[PDB]
Design a protein around this nucleic acid. Structure first.
Ligand SMILES: [Mg+2]
Ligand SMILES: [Zn+2]
Ligand SMILES: [Zn+2]
Lengths: 44, 51, 257, 94, 293, 101, 56, 65
DNA sequence: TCGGTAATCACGCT
């Protein structure tokens, strides 16, 4: 389990053991989305 | 084969025996300063803490 | 010692100072740049950034926004700067251009001076959230803490005798750029309150007929800010630092003996 | 601002001055020059990347006054001279 | 400091935006299948397994073995944790290895001199049946010393030092120069197109219209120096300049213009390395080649 | 020291390597320091010497008409290393003002 | 009887290695000094025990 | 790559006076009088309005989540 | 004279 977001928007939370496809789009390529935690960058 | 391992402009007289790779070195770029004496040199503090 | 205020405008001033000398003018000039403190954003905490720009770049623009620094509520002549921090937060969602004026401040005396600055453009469904922390600093440590600029020039007088062919061309030329000209039957005197590019025909006469004489002790000052401090407070604050700075010396000297 | 002496001799004083820069050092130098008893006033910043906050000052007198005494009274004047200009400035924007 | 092809860029001008350039790399770790039937899956490595790289380099990974984005990966930090399949279960029997039966750790980790933050993690499948993940990590890279600049006329050089805005020789207007170029390089290399362009930057910034400068049919030489001469300046660029350390007019007229430069990728953080005692050659037991090894 | 190395500063690369054992280190200091190599074995003449600004600065110092004032003499003797006492003396041409040659 | 430049850099080299392996030092003390720098001060006062052989 | 909010030499804000500048040059008016009509005095302020790319439009639409 | 064959052709770095 994960929550990968593909090209042309959509969500697809599946696993990792068998196959990696998007049911709605029909594609197979995935970006892992950014988290929602707080990091600290200085301005220089 | 053997005669090309012994020889061949990068064999085992010039390639590995009479010219070897060494330890305790560094390599970076140069940039002037006319405030130190004639026989001193600057050394970065990153290279100075790894030698 | 005397002053002559030529003009006062929003974020600019020009004046003439008399009764001083060459070393003092540089000390006054450098002090405005490297001693006067202002507030500036020093660190930004990101929660999410879906924009077209990198985290570092958005953080970099926040630091370049000039913030109002109320001089009647802290201390600008201290050797030890105050550490009071003001928090600038933002929570927006596209589409639309995000402006500097939308940043909210927890303290009404520290706000962006110019509200029409665009920070970043946002497309459909992209969110931008951050928290900015501002603190006092000096220009010598980082360029973001600069209150403005100062430029100064000598004050000179160009004497043009009427024996120079086509001297009438310089009178109209000087009048176009606003330099005062006092004319008499012997010659004319041009006061160079700003740069005076000599036209090419008169180069051979520079020194023979046309000569420049420096007026001892008078300097034309130009000070311009960006809106963080009034154009009148600046020179007063810098002078009060010099006094304080060169008094500590006397204290420290006695301690040695 | 702690004065770090190096050489101390007869009618001569050399020292380092932490926390200062070109701005103050040049102003104190030519102001000192005005004193006829000060034979020699000068400063240098050495290599402005490794150190740019401790100018090296040197004050030499003719023996009729000590180097510390000369320095002391000459940094009085700058405090008084700034005190003048400031009064002028304030009472002029009216 | 700007002797024999150096250059002295301003301090406050670096610190507002000049030449702030970014640098990217990418990594292409995969999941192969051997012909025996054993397929190596990637996950979080357990403490036991043979050939451990180290510990507390695994603080950024998720459960399955993928870095959740925007994390300051630096040094030799890992990127994807890979478990490999046994590789000769019965050769050694090193007094406890008969019972352990585990795996031989192989993985991917950043090259041991860089820094930066990840940007986007890809995950897909390539043609046959396997899986391959692409991870890319960026960097910020402010322009400090060493960083080679050049014009398009051939005046290459390196930042000499980085002098503050206060100590700058400035002019009888609001101008404070950026790049104080060495004057010993212009009447030695015969690059007169540098000096014509410097007037052409001052003319085409005050007039409003970008001066055409193409070969053989462009803007002529003499017509520029009249358009500058009626807009308020001397016919040859030269201006009255005051030094910033002491403050008195330098008894010369210092030349000044606008020249288009360009930064080059011979930047200094990709050159510096030090080696005390590292991994050696297998055949001779002599040090390796390159900074990547 | 940049006619022995035959270098310039357009992004070159120079490598140092520390010697370690106490016999090979006291040999490096006595036999290989820079000041022993001020003249060269190819022609006798000096090799480590002045370059671009060091020549053309020295012409502006020794021109007939190079009269420095009192502040500029005293400032430059502090910057060029030397240690002299209160003897910048004796103000050789006081014709305009008391300034040196 | 002046030394050459090759003999002066060998006498220091052998004496700086003995001064690290024991071999009690002459009047050379102050405050902290690397074993190479101790041999340089001893050679200036002319109290070196080590002599050369000149084949002739 | 949206306009830099300072100049690079003279510290002075500029991003409020770029989108008012370009919408009055797409009517045919000469830029020599438009930049003079605003508060631009030197030519160090002025070399960085007169030469810019405004490339944020192309990159934005390409998207990455 | 006269024909035949090998054996040779910067430094460092990615
Ligand atoms: Mg080179
Ligand atoms: Zn999809
Ligand atoms: Zn500018």
């Amino acid at each position: 389990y994960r929550c990968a977001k593909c090209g042309k928007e959509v969500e697809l939370d599946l696993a990792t053991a068998r196959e990696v496809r998007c049911p709605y789009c029909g594609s197979k390529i995935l970006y892992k989305p950014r988290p929602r935690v707080a990091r600290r960058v200085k301005a220089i | 084969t053997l005669a090309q391992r012994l020889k061949g402009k990068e064999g085992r007289f010039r390639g590995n025996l009479s010219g070897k790779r060494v330890n305790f070195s560094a390599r970076t770029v140069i940039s002037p300063d006319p405030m130190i004496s004639i026989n001193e040199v600057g050394v970065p503090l990153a290279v100075a803490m790894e030698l | 010692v005397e002053f002559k205020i030529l003009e006062k405008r929003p974020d600019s001033i020009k004046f003439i100072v008399s009764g001083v000398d060459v070393p003092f003018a540089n000390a006054l000039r450098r002090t405005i740049l490297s001693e006067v403190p202002t507030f500036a954003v020093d660190e930004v905490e990101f929660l999410e950034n879906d924009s077209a720009l990198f985290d570092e770049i958005i953080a970099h623009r926040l630091a370049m926004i000039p913030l109002t620094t109320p001089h009647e509520r802290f201390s600008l002549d201290a050797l030890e700067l105050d550490d009071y921090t003001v928090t600038l937060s933002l929570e927006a969602e596209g589409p639309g251009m995000v402006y500097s004026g939308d940043l909210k401040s927890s303290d009404g005396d520290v706000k962006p001076a110019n509200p029409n600055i665009p920070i970043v453009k946002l497309a459909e469904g992209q969110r931008l959230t951050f928290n900015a922390y501002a603190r006092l600093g000096r220009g010598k440590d980082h360029a973001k803490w600069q209150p403005g600029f100062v430029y100064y020039k000598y004050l000179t007088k160009i004497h043009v005798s009427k024996d120079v062919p086509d001297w009438e061309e310089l009178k109209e030329l000087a009048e176009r750029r606003g330099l005062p000209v006092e004319e008499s039957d012997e010659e004319i005197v041009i006061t160079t309150i700003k740069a005076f590019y000599l036209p090419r025909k008169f180069e051979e006469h520079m020194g023979k007929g046309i000569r420049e004489e420096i007026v001892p002790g008078s300097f034309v000052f130009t000070v311009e800010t960006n809106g963080e401090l009034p154009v009148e407070e600046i020179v007063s604050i810098a002078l009060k630092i010099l006094m304080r700075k060169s008094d500590r010396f006397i204290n420290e000297l006695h301690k040695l003996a | 601002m702690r004065i770090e002496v190096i050489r101390r001799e007869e009618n001569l004083l050399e020292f380092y001055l932490e926390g200062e820069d070109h701005t103050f050092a040049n102003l104190l130098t030519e102001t000192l020059h005005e004193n006829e008893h000060v034979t020699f006033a000068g400063y240098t910043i050495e290599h402005p990347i490794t150190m740019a906050r401790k100018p090296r000052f040197k004050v030499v007198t003719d023996g009729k006054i000590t180097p510390e005494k000369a320095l002391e009274e000459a940094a009085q004047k700058i405090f008084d001279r700034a005190r003048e200009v400031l009064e002028a400035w304030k009472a002029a924007i009216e | 400091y700007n002797m024999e092809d150096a250059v002295i860029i301003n301090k406050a001008s670096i610190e507002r935006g000049l030449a702030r350039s970014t640098f990217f790399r990418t990594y292409e770790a995969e999941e192969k299948r051997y012909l025996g039937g054993q397929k190596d899956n990637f996950e979080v490595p357990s403490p036991n397994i043979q050939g451990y790289l180290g510990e507390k380099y695994y603080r950024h990974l998720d459960e399955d073995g993928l870095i959740f984005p925007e994390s300051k990966v630096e040094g030799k930090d890992v990127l994807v944790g890979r478990t490999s399949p046994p590789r000769f279960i019965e050769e050694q029997s090193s007094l406890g290895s008969m019972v352990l039966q585990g795996r031989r750790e192989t993985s991917v980790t950043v090259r041991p001199s860089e820094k930066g933050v990840v940007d986007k993690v890809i995950v897909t499948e390539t043609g046959d049946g396997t899986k391959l993940v692409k991870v890319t990590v960026r960097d910020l890279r402010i322009p400090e010393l060493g960083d080679k600049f050049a014009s398009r006329h051939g005046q290459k050089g390196v930042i000499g030092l980085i002098v503050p805005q206060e100590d700058m020789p400035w002019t009888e207007s609001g101008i404070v120069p950026d790049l104080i170029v060495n004057p010993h390089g212009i009447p030695s290399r015969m690059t007169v197109g540098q000096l014509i362009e410097a007037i052409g930057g001052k003319v085409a910034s005050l007039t409003g219209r970008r001066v055409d400068g193409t070969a053989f049919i462009g803007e002529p030489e003499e017509k520029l120096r009249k358009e500058l001469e009626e807009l308020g300046f001397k016919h040859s660029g030269r201006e009255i300049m005051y030094d910033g350390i002491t403050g008195r007019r330098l008894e010369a007229d210092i030349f000044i213009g606008v020249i288009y430069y360009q930064r080059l990728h011979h930047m200094v953080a990709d050159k510096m390395h030090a080696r005390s005692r590292g991994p050696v050659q297998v055949l001779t037991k002599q040090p390796t080649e390159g900074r990547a090894r | 020291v940049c006619p022995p190395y035959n270098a310039d500063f357009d992004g070159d690369e120079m490598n140092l390597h520390v010697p370690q054992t106490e016999e090979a280190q006291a040999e490096a200091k006595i036999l290989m320091e820079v000041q022993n190599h001020i003249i060269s074995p190819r022609y006798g003449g000096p090799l480590i010497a002045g370059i671009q600004d060091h020549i053309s600065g020295g012409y502006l110092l020794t021109r007939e008409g190079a009269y420095f004032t009192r502040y500029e003499v005293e400032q430059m003797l502090m910057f060029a290393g030397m240690d002299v006492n209160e003897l910048p003396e004796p103000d050789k041409y006081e014709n305009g003002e008391p300034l040196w040659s | 009887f002046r030394y050459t430049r090759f003999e002066k850099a060998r006498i220091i080299g052998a004496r700086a290695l003995q001064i690290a392996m024991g071999a009690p030092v002459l009047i050379d003390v102050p405050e902290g000094i690397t074993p190479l720098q101790a041999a340089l001060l001893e050679f200036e006062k002319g109290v070196i025990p080590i002599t050369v052989i000149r084949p002739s | 790559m949206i306009v830099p909010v300072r100049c690079f030499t003279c510290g002075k804000v500029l991003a409020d006076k770029y989108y008012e500048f370009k919408k009055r040059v797409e009517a045919g008016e000469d830029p020599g009088k438009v930049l003079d009509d605003l508060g631009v005095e030197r030519y160090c302020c002025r070399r960085t309005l007169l030469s810019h790319v405004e490339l944020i439009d192309q990159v934005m639409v390409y998207k990455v989540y």
